[PDB]
Amino acid sequence: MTNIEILENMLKLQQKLNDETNGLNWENGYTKEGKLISWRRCIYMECAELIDSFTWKHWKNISSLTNWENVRIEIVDIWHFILSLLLEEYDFKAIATEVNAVSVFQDFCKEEEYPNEGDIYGILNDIELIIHKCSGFGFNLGELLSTYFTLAIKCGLNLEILYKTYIGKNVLNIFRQNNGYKDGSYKKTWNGKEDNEVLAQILEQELDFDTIYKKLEECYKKA
Amino acid sequence: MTNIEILENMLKLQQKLNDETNGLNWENGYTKEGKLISWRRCIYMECAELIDSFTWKHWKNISSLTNWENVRIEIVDIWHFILSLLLEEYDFKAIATEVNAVSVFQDFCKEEEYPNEGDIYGILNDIELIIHKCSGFGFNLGELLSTYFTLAIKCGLNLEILYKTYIGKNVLNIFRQNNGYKDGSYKKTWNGKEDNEVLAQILEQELDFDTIYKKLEECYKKA
Ligand SMILES: O=c1ccn([C@H]2C[C@H](O)[C@@H](COP(=O)(O)NP(=O)(O)OP(=O)(O)O)O2)c(=O)[nH]1
Ligand SMILES: O=c1ccn([C@H]2C[C@H](O)[C@@H](COP(=O)(O)NP(=O)(O)OP(=O)(O)O)O2)c(=O)[nH]1
Numbered sequence: 014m015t016n017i018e019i020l021e022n023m024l025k026l027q028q029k030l031n032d033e034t035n036g037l038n039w040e041n042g043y044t045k046e047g048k049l050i051s052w053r054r055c056i057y058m059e060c061a062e063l064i065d066s067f068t069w070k071h072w073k074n075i076s077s078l079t080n081w082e083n084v085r086i087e088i089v090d091i092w093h094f095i096l097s098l099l100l101e102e103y104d105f106k107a108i109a110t111e112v113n114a115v116s117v118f119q120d121f122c123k124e125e126e127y128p129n130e131g132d133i134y135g136i137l138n139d140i141e142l143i144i145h146k147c148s149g150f151g152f153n154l155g156e157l158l159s160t161y162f163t164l165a166i167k168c169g170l171n172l173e174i175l176y177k178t179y180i181g182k183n184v185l186n187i188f189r190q191n192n193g194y195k196d197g198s199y200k201k202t203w204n205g206k207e208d209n210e211v212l213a214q215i216l217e218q219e220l221d222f223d224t225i226y227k228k229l230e231e232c233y234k235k236a
Numbered sequence: 237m238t239n240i241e242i243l244e245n246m247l248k249l250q251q252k253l254n255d256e257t258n259g260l261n262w263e264n265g266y267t268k269e270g271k272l273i274s275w276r277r278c279i280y281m282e283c284a285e286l287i288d289s290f291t292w293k294h295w296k297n298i299s300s301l302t303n304w305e306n307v308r309i310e311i312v313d314i315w316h317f318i319l320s321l322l323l324e325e326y327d328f329k330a331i332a333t334e335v336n337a338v339s340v341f342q343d344f345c346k347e348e349e350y351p352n353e354g355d356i357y358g359i360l361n362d363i364e365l366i367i368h369k370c371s372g373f374g375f376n377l378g379e380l381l382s383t384y385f386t387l388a389i390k391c392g393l394n395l396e397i398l399y400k401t402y403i404g405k406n407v408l409n410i411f412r413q414n415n416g417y418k419d420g421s422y423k424k425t426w427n428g429k430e431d432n433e434v435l436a437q438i439l440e441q442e443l444d445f446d447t448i449y450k451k452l453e454e455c456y457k458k459a
C-alpha cells in the first residue's frame with residue numbers, strides 16, 4: 014500500500030468505528046444517546062493521559078523508567094481523535110492527500126527512532142504544544158498534524174508502527190462498544206490484566222481485524 | 237480572620253508544604269532530588285483530573301451523576317498549584333492583597349451555589365479556558381485567578397469551603413511526603429479506601445492540622 018492508501022484506510026476504519034460508537038451523523042456534534050462530542054477535548058484529555066506515562070510529577074515516584082509500549086498506544090489513541098476531528102471538519106482520499114502533504118509526514122515514514130529517558134522533557138514540551146493548540150479555538154489542522162507527527166517521531170513511531178497499532182486499538186474500541194462500554198457494564202480488567210495490555214499481547218503476533226476481535230472475545234469470556 | 241488573612245495563611249501553608257516536598261529554593265525550578273518543577277503543567281494536569289469527575293466522555297459510562305465532594309477536592313488541588321505559581325512568580329501579605337483585588341474574588345466570598353448536572357458543560361468550558369491559558373506562555377496571573385474563582389463558584393465553593401478543604405488536603409500532602417511518596421513506597425489505598433476519601437471522612441469533624449495528621453497516621457498504620 015502507498016502511504017496515502019494507509020491513511021485512507023485509517024480514515025475508513027475511524028469512520029466505521031465512530032458510526033458504531035456514536036451513530037450516523039455524529040459529525041453534527043451529538044451521539045445518538047445525546048452526548049455532546051468535543052474532539053478538541055478528546056485530544057487534550059488523551060494528551061494528559063500520554064503525559065502520565067512519564068515521570069513528570071516532581072513529588073511522586075520520581076524514579077520510574079518509561080514504558081514506551083504504553084506510550085505507543087497513547088499516541089495511537091490521540092491519532093483516533095485527530096482522525097475524528099479531520100472527518101468532522103470534513104472523500105477519504107482527499108483528506109488523506111492533505112495529511113500526506115504536511116511536510117513532517119515524509120519524515121514520519123522513515124525508519125523509527127529509539128527514544129530514551131533523556132527525551133522526556135522535549136516530549137512533554139511537544140505534548141504541551143498540542144494541549145495548548147486544541148484547548149483553544151480556530152487553530153490550523155495542518156499545524157496540529159505537523160506537531161503531532163513531530164511528537165510521534167520523538168516517541169519512536171513511524172507510519173508502519175502507527176498503522177499496525179492503530180488497527181489493533183480500533184478493534185478493541187469496537188469490542189468495548191459491543192460489550193457495554195456506554196452503559197458502564199463493561200469490565201476493563203480481565204483477571205488482573207487491563208484490556209489494553211491483553212491487546213498489546215495479541216499485537217505481538219501479526220493478526221487481522223477479525224482474528225484480533227476473536228482473541229479479545231475469548232479472553233473477555235474469562236473475566 | 238479577614239479574607240486577606242485567610243489568603244495569607246494559605247500562602248504560608250503552601251510555602252511550608254513546598255519547602256518540605258521540594259526543599260528550600262524550589263522557586264528556582266528544581267527539587268532537591270533534581271526534578272524539574274513546572275507549576276503550569278501541575279495546573280493543566282490537575283484540570284484534566286477535575287474534568288474526569290464529569291461525564292464528559294461521549295462513549296463511556298454516559299450516565300453517571302457527579303460527585304461534588306470529589307470536585308471540591310480537585311478545585312483545592314488546583315488551588316495548591318496556583319498558590320505555588322504565585323509564590324514562584326514572587327511577602328505573603330503583598331500577594332494576598334493582590335489576590336483579594338481580583339474583581340470576582342468578592343463574589344467568591346459570598347454564600348455558595350449548589351450546582352447540578354445542568355451545569356457540567358459550562359464548568360467544562362471554564363476548565364478548558366484554564367487548561368488553554370496555563371499550557372501557553374506569558375499569561376496574566378490576574379486573569380488566571382479570575383477564571384479560577386469563576387470556576388470555583390460554578391462548582392459550589394466559596395472562600396470558607398476552599399479554606400477548610402485546603403487545610404485538610406495540605407495535611408494529606410505533608411503526610412504523603414513523610415511516608416514515601418517520592419520513592420514510590422507509599423500506599424495510596426488503605427483497606428480499599430483511597431487516602432483522599434479517608435481525608436474527606438476526617439474533614440466531616442472540624443479538626444486542626446495536627447489532629448488531622450494524627451487521624452491519617454492511625455488509618456495508614458492499618459494498611
Ligand atoms: O467516538 C469515539 C470515542 C472513542 N474513541 C476511541 C479512541 C481511543 O483509542 C479510545 C480511548 O478510550 P478510553 O478513553 O475510554 N480508554 P483508554 O483505552 O484510553 O484506556 P484507559 O481506561 O486505560 O484510560 O476511544 C473513538 O475512536 N471514537
Ligand atoms: O510541590 C508540590 C507538589 C504537589 N503538591 C500537592 C498539591 C495537590 O493537592 C497534590 C496532588 O497530588 P497528586 O497529583 O500526587 N495526587 P491526588 O491527591 O491529586 O490524587 P490521585 O492519586 O487521586 O490522582 O500535590 C503541592 O502542593 N506541592
Ligand SMILES: [Mg+2]
Nearest residue numbers: 058059062090
Ligand atoms: Mg483515554
Ligand SMILES: [Mg+2]
Nearest residue numbers: 062086087090
Ligand atoms: Mg489511552
Ligand SMILES: [Mg+2]
Nearest residue numbers: 281282285313
Ligand atoms: Mg493530581
Ligand SMILES: [Mg+2]
Nearest residue numbers: 285309310313
Ligand atoms: Mg487530585
